[PDB]
Amino acid sequence: AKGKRTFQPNNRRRARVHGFRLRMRTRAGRAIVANRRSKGRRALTA
RNA sequence: AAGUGUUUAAGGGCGCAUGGUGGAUGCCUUGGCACUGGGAGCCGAUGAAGGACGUAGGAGGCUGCGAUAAGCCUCGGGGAGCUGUCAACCGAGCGUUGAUCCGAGGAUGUCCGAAUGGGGAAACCCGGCACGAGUGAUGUCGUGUCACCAGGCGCUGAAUAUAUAGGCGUCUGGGGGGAACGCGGGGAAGUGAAACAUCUCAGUACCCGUAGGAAGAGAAAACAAAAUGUGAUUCCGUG
RNA sequence: CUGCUGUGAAUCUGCCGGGACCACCCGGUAAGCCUGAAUACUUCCCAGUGACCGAUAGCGGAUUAGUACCGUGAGGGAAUGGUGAAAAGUACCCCGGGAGGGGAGUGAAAGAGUACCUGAAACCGUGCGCUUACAAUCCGUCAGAGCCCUCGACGUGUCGUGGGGUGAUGGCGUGCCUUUUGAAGAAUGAGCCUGCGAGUCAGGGACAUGUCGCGAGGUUAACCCGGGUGGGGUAGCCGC
RNA sequence: UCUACCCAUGGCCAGGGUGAAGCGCGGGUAAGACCGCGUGGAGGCCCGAACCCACUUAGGUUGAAGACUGAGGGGAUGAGCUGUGGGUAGGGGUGAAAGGCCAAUCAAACUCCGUGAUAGCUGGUUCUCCCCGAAAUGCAUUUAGGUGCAGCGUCGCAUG
RNA sequence: GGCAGCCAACGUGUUGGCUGGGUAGGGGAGCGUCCUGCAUCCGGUGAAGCCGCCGAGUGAUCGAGUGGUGGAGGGUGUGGGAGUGAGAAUGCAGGCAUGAGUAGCGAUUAGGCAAGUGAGAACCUUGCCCGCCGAAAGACCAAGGGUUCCUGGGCCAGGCCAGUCCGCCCAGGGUGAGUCGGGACCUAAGGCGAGGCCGACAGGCGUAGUCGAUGGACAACGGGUUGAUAUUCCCGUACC
RNA sequence: UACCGGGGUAAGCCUGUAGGGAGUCAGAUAGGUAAAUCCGUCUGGCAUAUAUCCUGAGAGGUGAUGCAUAGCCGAGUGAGGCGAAUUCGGUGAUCCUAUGCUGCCGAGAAAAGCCUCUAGCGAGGACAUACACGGCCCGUACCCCAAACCAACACAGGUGGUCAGGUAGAGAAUACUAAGGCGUACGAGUGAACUAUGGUUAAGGAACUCGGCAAAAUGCCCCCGUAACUUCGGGAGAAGGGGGACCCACAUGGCGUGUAAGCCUUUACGGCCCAAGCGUGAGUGGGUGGCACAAACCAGUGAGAAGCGACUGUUUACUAAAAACACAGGUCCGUGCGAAGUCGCAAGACGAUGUAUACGGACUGACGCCUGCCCGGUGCUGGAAGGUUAAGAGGACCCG
RNA sequence: AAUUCCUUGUCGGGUAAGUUCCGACCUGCACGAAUGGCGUAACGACUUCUCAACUGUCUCAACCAUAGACUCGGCGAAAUUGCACUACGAGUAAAGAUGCUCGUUACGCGCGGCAGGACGAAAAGACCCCGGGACCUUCACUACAACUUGGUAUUGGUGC
RNA sequence: UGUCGCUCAACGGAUAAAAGGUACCCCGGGGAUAACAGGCUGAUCUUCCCCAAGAGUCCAUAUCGACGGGAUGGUUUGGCACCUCGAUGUCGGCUCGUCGCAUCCUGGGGCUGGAGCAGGUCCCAAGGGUUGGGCUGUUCGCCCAUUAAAGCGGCACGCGAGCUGGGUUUAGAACGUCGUGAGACAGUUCGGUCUCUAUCCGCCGCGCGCGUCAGAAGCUUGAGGAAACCUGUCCCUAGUACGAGAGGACCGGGACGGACGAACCUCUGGUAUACCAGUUGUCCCACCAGGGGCACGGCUGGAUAGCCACGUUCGGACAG
Ligand SMILES: COC(=O)NC[C@H]1CN(c2cc(F)c(N3CCS(=O)(=O)CC3)c(F)c2)C(=O)O1
Ligand SMILES: [Mg+2]
Ligand SMILES: [Mg+2]
Ligand SMILES: [Mg+2]
Ligand SMILES: [Mg+2]
Ligand SMILES: [Mg+2]
Ligand SMILES: [Mg+2]
Ligand SMILES: [Mg+2]
Ligand SMILES: [Mg+2]
Ligand SMILES: [Mg+2]
Ligand SMILES: [Mg+2]
Ligand SMILES: [Mg+2]
Numbered sequence A: 001a002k003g004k005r006t007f008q009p010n011n012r013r014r015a016r017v018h019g020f021r022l023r024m025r026t027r028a029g030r031a032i033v034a035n036r037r038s039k040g041r042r043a044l045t046a
Numbered sequence B: 001a002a003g004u005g006u007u008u009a010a011g012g013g014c015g016c017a018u019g020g021u022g023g024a025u026g027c028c029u030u031g032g033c034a035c036u037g038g039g040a041g042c043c044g045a046u047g048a049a050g051g052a053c054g055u056a057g058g059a060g061g062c063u064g065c066g067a068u069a070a071g072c073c074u075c076g077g078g079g080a081g082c083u084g085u086c087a088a089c090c091g092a093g094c095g096u097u098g099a100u101c102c103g104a105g106g107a108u109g110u111c112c113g114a115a116u117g118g119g120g121a122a123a124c125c126c127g128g129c130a131c132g133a134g135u136g137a138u139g140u141c142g143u144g145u146c147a148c149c150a151g152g153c154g155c156u157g158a159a160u161a162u163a164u165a166g167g168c169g170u171c172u173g174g175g176g177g178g179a180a181c182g183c184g185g186g187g188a189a190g191u192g193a194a195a196c197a198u199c200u201c202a203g204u205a206c207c208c209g210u211a212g213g214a215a216g217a218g219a220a221a222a223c224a225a226a227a228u229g230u231g232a233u234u235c236c237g238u239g
Numbered sequence C: 001c002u003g004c005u006g007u008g009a010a011u012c013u014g015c016c017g018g019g020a021c022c023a024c025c026c027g028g029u030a031a032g033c034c035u036g037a038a039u040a041c042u043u044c045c046c047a048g049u050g051a052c053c054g055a056u057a058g059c060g061g062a063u064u065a066g067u068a069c070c071g072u073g074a075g076g077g078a079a080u081g082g083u084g085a086a087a088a089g090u091a092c093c094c095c096g097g098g099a100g101g102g103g104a105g106u107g108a109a110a111g112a113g114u115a116c117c118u119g120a121a122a123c124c125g126u127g128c129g130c131u132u133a134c135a136a137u138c139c140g141u142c143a144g145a146g147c148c149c150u151c152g153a154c155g156u157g158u159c160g161u162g163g164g165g166u167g168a169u170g171g172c173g174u175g176c177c178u179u180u181u182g183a184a185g186a187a188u189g190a191g192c193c194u195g196c197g198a199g200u201c202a203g204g205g206a207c208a209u210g211u212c213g214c215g216a217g218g219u220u221a222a223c224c225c226g227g228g229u230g231g232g233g234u235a236g237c238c239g240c
Numbered sequence D: 001u002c003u004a005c006c007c008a009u010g011g012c013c014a015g016g017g018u019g020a021a022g023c024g025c026g027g028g029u030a031a032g033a034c035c036g037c038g039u040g041g042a043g044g045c046c047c048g049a050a051c052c053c054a055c056u057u058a059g060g061u062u063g064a065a066g067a068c069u070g071a072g073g074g075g076a077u078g079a080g081c082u083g084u085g086g087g088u089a090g091g092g093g094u095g096a097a098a099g100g101c102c103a104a105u106c107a108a109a110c111u112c113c114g115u116g117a118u119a120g121c122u123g124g125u126u127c128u129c130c131c132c133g134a135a136a137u138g139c140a141u142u143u144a145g146g147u148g149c150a151g152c153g154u155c156g157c158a159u160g
Numbered sequence E: 001g002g003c004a005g006c007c008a009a010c011g012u013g014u015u016g017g018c019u020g021g022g023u024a025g026g027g028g029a030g031c032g033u034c035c036u037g038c039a040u041c042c043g044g045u046g047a048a049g050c051c052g053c054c055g056a057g058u059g060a061u062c063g064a065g066u067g068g069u070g071g072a073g074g075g076u077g078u079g080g081g082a083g084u085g086a087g088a089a090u091g092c093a094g095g096c097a098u099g100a101g102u103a104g105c106g107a108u109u110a111g112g113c114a115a116g117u118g119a120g121a122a123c124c125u126u127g128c129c130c131g132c133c134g135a136a137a138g139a140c141c142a143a144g145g146g147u148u149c150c151u152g153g154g155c156c157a158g159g160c161c162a163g164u165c166c167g168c169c170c171a172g173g174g175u176g177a178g179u180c181g182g183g184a185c186c187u188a189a190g191g192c193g194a195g196g197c198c199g200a201c202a203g204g205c206g207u208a209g210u211c212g213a214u215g216g217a218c219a220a221c222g223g224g225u226u227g228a229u230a231u232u233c234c235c236g237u238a239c240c
Numbered sequence F: 001u002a003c004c005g006g007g008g009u010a011a012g013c014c015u016g017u018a019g020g021g022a023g024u025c026a027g028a029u030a031g032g033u034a035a036a037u038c039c040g041u042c043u044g045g046c047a048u049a050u051a052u053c054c055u056g057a058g059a060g061g062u063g064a065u066g067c068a069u070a071g072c073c074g075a076g077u078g079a080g081g082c083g084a085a086u087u088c089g090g091u092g093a094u095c096c097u098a099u100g101c102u103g104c105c106g107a108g109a110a111a112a113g114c115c116u117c118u119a120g121c122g123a124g125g126a127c128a129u130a131c132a133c134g135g136c137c138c139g140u141a142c143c144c145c146a147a148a149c150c151a152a153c154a155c156a157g158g159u160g161g162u163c164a165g166g167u168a169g170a171g172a173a174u175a176c177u178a179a180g181g182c183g184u185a186c187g188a189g190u191g192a193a194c195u196a197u198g199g200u201u202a203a204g205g206a207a208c209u210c211g212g213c214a215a216a217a218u219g220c221c222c223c224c225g226u227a228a229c230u231u232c233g234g235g236a237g238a239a240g241g242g243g244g245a246c247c248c249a250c251a252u253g254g255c256g257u258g259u260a261a262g263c264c265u266u267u268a269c270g271g272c273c274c275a276a277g278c279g280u281g282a283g284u285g286g287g288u289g290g291c292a293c294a295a296a297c298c299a300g301u302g303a304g305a306a307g308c309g310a311c312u313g314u315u316u317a318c319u320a321a322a323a324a325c326a327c328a329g330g331u332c333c334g335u336g337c338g339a340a341g342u343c344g345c346a347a348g349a350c351g352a353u354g355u356a357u358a359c360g361g362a363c364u365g366a367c368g369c370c371u372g373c374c375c376g377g378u379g380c381u382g383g384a385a386g387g388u389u390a391a392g393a394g395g396a397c398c399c400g
Numbered sequence G: 001a002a003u004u005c006c007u008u009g010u011c012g013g014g015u016a017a018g019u020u021c022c023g024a025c026c027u028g029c030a031c032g033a034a035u036g037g038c039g040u041a042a043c044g045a046c047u048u049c050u051c052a053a054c055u056g057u058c059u060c061a062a063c064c065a066u067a068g069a070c071u072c073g074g075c076g077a078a079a080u081u082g083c084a085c086u087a088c089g090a091g092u093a094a095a096g097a098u099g100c101u102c103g104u105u106a107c108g109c110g111c112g113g114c115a116g117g118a119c120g121a122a123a124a125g126a127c128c129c130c131g132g133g134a135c136c137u138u139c140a141c142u143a144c145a146a147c148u149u150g151g152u153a154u155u156g157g158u159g160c
Numbered sequence H: 001u002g003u004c005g006c007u008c009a010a011c012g013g014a015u016a017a018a019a020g021g022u023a024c025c026c027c028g029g030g031g032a033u034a035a036c037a038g039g040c041u042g043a044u045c046u047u048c049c050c051c052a053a054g055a056g057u058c059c060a061u062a063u064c065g066a067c068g069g070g071a072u073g074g075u076u077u078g079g080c081a082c083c084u085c086g087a088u089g090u091c092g093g094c095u096c097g098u099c100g101c102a103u104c105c106u107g108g109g110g111c112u113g114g115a116g117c118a119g120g121u122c123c124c125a126a127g128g129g130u131u132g133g134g135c136u137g138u139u140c141g142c143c144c145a146u147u148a149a150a151g152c153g154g155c156a157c158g159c160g161a162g163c164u165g166g167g168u169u170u171a172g173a174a175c176g177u178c179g180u181g182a183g184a185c186a187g188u189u190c191g192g193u194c195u196c197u198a199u200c201c202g203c204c205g206c207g208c209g210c211g212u213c214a215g216a217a218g219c220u221u222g223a224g225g226a227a228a229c230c231u232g233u234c235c236c237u238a239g240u241a242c243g244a245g246a247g248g249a250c251c252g253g254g255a256c257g258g259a260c261g262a263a264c265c266u267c268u269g270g271u272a273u274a275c276c277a278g279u280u281g282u283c284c285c286a287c288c289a290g291g292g293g294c295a296c297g298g299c300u301g302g303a304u305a306g307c308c309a310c311g312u313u314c315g316g317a318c319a320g
């Protein structure tokens, strides 16, 4: 009986790992935002 | 007496007649696809591309707009109906003294975003200075302005003498985005070779730096072959 | 021709090219810069076209679509169009808690009722006819009794150049596909229906073979001029 | 955001045993060594809940559950367990080392792109009829279930 | 007695002789589907599609032969062009069978009766009993969730049965702080990082700084009140 | 006389008890990136006091004529009014004094804040009382061991922290139970086989089986009594055995606590003693009852010997927990210091704010007794007399 | 012997009976000294053998309760599936027949049960072979990083 | 033009240039190809036979039968590669069986180098029976007590959609050995997931329907099936027959058992969830007394009926 799942939600950690400001820090992340915008995604980031 | 002999359908099968389910088929379309001829080929610190949150007399989505919020002003068009739409229903109003609507030019344009007063988990937290408003005063509220770097111009010139590095002040720029096309750099592998390393795939995919409306190239230290030759570059057809 | 690393000249008798190199001729004048047109492309805007698609097609997206939904994230990523000319969308009555239905209305039609054009098949019912509970069945086929229906002539049913439905009973009879020397095979694939799903296209390409034009000649490429599919264009190419 | 290890900062460990060093006193001695009796409360110490494990067994095995449940079992002041916040990234990480683990996937994660990768291999390839009609041999082969040429089919032309 | 291929014989297409099992495979000739140039014809006096009847051809198949359904296009001839034919790929999408009215309906506590509500009650409400947890199955939070909370209404989806009930559907309402938990205070690991150093470019590190609680500092307690908030509102008494 | 329910009330502000912690004044100084009366350091004088001061549980007072409450009125929508007593003891924390104290080795954040010192500001300024005022932003509903979070489900799994009633009990185990909360969402029947989960069993007692797998057994407290061997710690709860209930007496006893009275004094939040009252074992003697006195639940099986590994630990998330890994201990090799090693293209970083008693790598693996022979092969270390050997130099001779 | 092929070696012990176990012998297929040798108190959910106690493990099984199973009401799946009014024997066949031959047996339809067959279901056999991958090794080949040699540039002066 | 340079010898000559491991394995394929089972064959194996050289004092043939020869069977090891690699799970044990006779016991016989008892060998016979333990994963085998006897084989070496999982044969680890190494070993050692709700046939049970020439009811015949079928010891006959003795019967009678099966519950014994009693902890019924709830039916001592075996009774014939 270990029963611990992989997804342990934490909103701060979500933002710090996947958030808008993180993405914008690097060229790769900025490319991600541009690509999702080009696809027409409503949500560009976490 | 012996012998002959129909006569059940619990249920099933097959055929037909009537239905259900389902959404094929036929015929369509407010949507696509491939192209042709034109236009425009950039937008951004005067804050972009794209967003968050708001905004109509009534809940939400799409559309429009930004606290002046389905809108404000001006110049033109237009001519009887209008208050975007899903979407009506109710409740109120405008318009021949020209509404709704269409075109052009202005005004307003919260917050986030290069994001740039400082900070931050984008759209939310906290300020300096100047002017104004408001308080009995503190608190509070408007409107400007305050990142960094590069390059002009002015002042100053450390250790240290000459000086210089640097430090103040001020003006002018840059930053980010965009489907393809350009130029200059970096540069695979699957694969082919019926194995594989040279070679191929291929200077392809991808990546980096920069453009422009196109770019690059361009005005012979060129070709040619004895012809009394041609005469910048680019691009197309041949060879 | 050109990068990096060394070395390192001449100013016209100079120097650099004419596929190692040398000589002779020829061409040109490096180590400075700028330069339009012919060429490439279309996020976006305007006007059009199609021997292009027509809702499992065409864009992933005709429907809140890059949405719902999936993933921590990069990222992945659907499904859903048609009433009728007009909403005239069924007042009112009846059964029912509703749902739904039956009368009555509207409509050309409700065999058009917001579950809506047409309404196939699988699949699921109800009714009628024949058949089936002593039988061993790849499920059918060829003979065939009996019953039911129908078309002719005759008469009360009975026969025919008949036609259908069902079928007691007899003979014969080992699914389909793939793949194998050989499979009913106890080898592979298929639960069923509907829809979709595989030799296509480009190039004066190559060889062959039809066909058409011209013929010792045939033909143009780019390009130019026509709102066209037409006219022009000799560079080439292939024969000789 | 699972998991491995590390960094910073917090929390948690019922109850009951055992009795190290040190200290004190009394024996003992010339002084000691040494020996009793207290005090003391040490330890990857003992028994045992929470908590952390997963040893044996039965059940589950289209589960209640993509790893669990019941019954017993081990550790339980420590190389302990745990919260919050943080760090290391793919030929790389981390590993008290099982090639373990790195989001139910690991002898090289996942996603998109090159990309419709390539398969001498397996499967599939859809209407009809008319005429003809094979081969499973020879030679060679990084060849033996592949392929080239020959042999054997067909269509056309020629020769009869 | 019908059809066909090859060949012969003559004729302005008939007669005769021979031949006609067939996988891989070669050759020949056709059927059906769609889109089109041209020419013709049919169609609200009812096109296509679909379901039948009665018939037809050597086959793919046909019916400008006819009923029913249906509602707007279709046929034919001759040419041009194909997303042109499926039964099978453990093929794909949708619909639906078989297993089958079968297995299950998710613990280790357990329900019973009376009365009420209602169209309907084993499951909803109230009362009286019974049973279970009680280092929890009680009470209060962080994380996470996001209106699930309260009142009124609802009962065709959802709830593994039913349902008048619901954590489900609908409308309205509800969250009040100088002291609580955070910011405006402080720093840890770590992150970012003016200049800077390093690195072909992309970038890698890092100084001054500036962020970053799980820690440091810092002022409120008891009582009452709403259907739903309370160290927040109110009362009493405090503190910064 | 028996029984049931009450037998309540915070922060703050007074007061400064238990406990803990402290010497003070004077002279000199540029060590504290300038200065200092502060701090540090050095020299002198005066101190061992219940002296003084700081800190601090709690008792007591106030807060409180208030608030709250057992009940009682009527009256039911459930709102409203009235409202007693409130003493003394015992027991007792995992909470407080306590960031204390004592012990130990592994030697145990930072910054703000607060205090103080000058530098530097200064003509105005400090303090107290009264009155009138400002005190921003975000969260605040509800669930939160769960059908509201992570689990595709109204899923037997998972989820950190804070409260801890009573009787048995060592206990937060376990049994029953209070407050509070549930009966949790398919049911009703029915003695089929069979499966699952529990229960009992004549006689026998491992004959079962790969194997005592699974069950059964042992189990608590207080006494008695315990071997080989040993690293002298252990082994050890070794083994083996006895007692345990209830009533009465000893007992107006013993022990803990401690009021009245009394005694002492530094008279106060003092000290000594203490009948009563309350709580509480252990033992001894006699009796009483049962089949059974650890009464249920709870709760070691023990012994002899061998192999491996010394030991506590660690490991294949999801078939292996071990003899594998780790380990303390050992030896070798490297490393003289932005070391060696490692990450990185570099800068830079870790190693380490370490310096050979250190750090890295390798093999071995507590401890005891020990660890022989071989340097031919292949590595590693050192050497360079020979053989061979790149680019760079040279440039004979030859060829156009 | 965790090492011994022959091998259940041989002798002793334990048992009524011992291929395992304990003590020895040495004929070590094929122990041996930090891939340490031989021992070792303590320790072990390790592995092995023996004994006491205890028992449904067994002789040998019986009975009780609960949850399913079963019946009634409600809701309502799944894997599988070319067909179907799906007997048996002895044969025959791609050599193991419900489906072919000859014969035998058998009224139609269900319910509860058992698992011999349907070469039952699941999963394009993990074995083996053929073709292709991957990762690992090394005195296989060819490269590259890193390290290292000399020349030359940065790089100079005076002396021997 | 002439000629030279290749153990390119894998010699039609893939590169000028190349070895291994995988039990950590993965994918595409094959029953074109092995490991299990089936099938063919039958060398080998097995069972029997033909000839009779000899052995047996003499005497081939009571009993053995050399050298050679001919076959059966198809359970051994093989040979072959025909079905199955889009899956036919293995050894041993357990449970349940079913068939053959080449018969282990019991039954019936011939011949004996059969006096008797007890045997040897061959023929006929398959109804029933054919034990429990120690060692090993074992099959096999050896051993310990018994027995009338402790038969040999087939059925996918019967039986894992019935169970087990000790051996073997995944991944961990270790020893010896081999390999420079990754690794390897029909060498050894410790450890290591055994899935499935039964549609069809088949089998065990139980109903519904219809039929058997009207609708019903009681009692029946038995075509045809199924079950059952074992055996010992002791005492008489008899210490007789036979025999030197030792020893010791056939045939025919009687009693008492083992194993197995059936029915049954009087007895003995087991069970007992609404029976009675005792008793611990706790909560409750205000309280005492008396009771109840919960803790395995709390625990403990008993326990009629039902069900049951360890119990009771009966069976296997007798005759044709
Ligand atoms: C594991 O299941 C299957 O592969 N199923 C598919 C086929 C193959 N097969 C089978 C079974 C076996 F047990 C063996 N054995 C015997 C024991 S052994 O001596 O260890 C050697 C291996 C075999 F070779 C083939 C079967 O039954 O069907
Ligand atoms: Mg421009
Ligand atoms: Mg900003
Ligand atoms: Mg910033
Ligand atoms: Mg100067
Ligand atoms: Mg730019
Ligand atoms: Mg290749
Ligand atoms: Mg290839
Ligand atoms: Mg230009
Ligand atoms: Mg030249
Ligand atoms: Mg230029
Ligand atoms: Mg359609």
Ligand SMILES: [Mg+2]
Pocket: none
């Ligand atoms: Mg579409």
Ligand SMILES: [Mg+2]
Pocket: C071
């Ligand atoms: Mg993922």
Ligand SMILES: [Mg+2]
Pocket: none
């Ligand atoms: Mg998401």
Ligand SMILES: [Mg+2]
Pocket: C109
């Ligand atoms: Mg109509």
Ligand SMILES: [Mg+2]
Pocket: C115
């Ligand atoms: Mg419909």
Ligand SMILES: [Mg+2]
Pocket: C119
């Ligand atoms: Mg319709």
Ligand SMILES: [Mg+2]
Pocket: none
């Ligand atoms: Mg009949």
Ligand SMILES: [Mg+2]
Pocket: none
């Ligand atoms: Mg027959």
Ligand SMILES: [Mg+2]
Pocket: none
């Ligand atoms: Mg026949």
Ligand SMILES: [Mg+2]
Pocket: none
């Ligand atoms: Mg074959």
Ligand SMILES: [Mg+2]
Pocket: none
């Ligand atoms: Mg063939």
Ligand SMILES: [Mg+2]
Pocket: none
């Ligand atoms: Mg088949």
Ligand SMILES: [Mg+2]
Pocket: none
């Ligand atoms: Mg079949």
Ligand SMILES: [Mg+2]
Pocket: none
């Ligand atoms: Mg195959």
Ligand SMILES: [Mg+2]
Pocket: none
């Ligand atoms: Mg299939």
Ligand SMILES: [Mg+2]
Pocket: D045
């Ligand atoms: Mg311990």
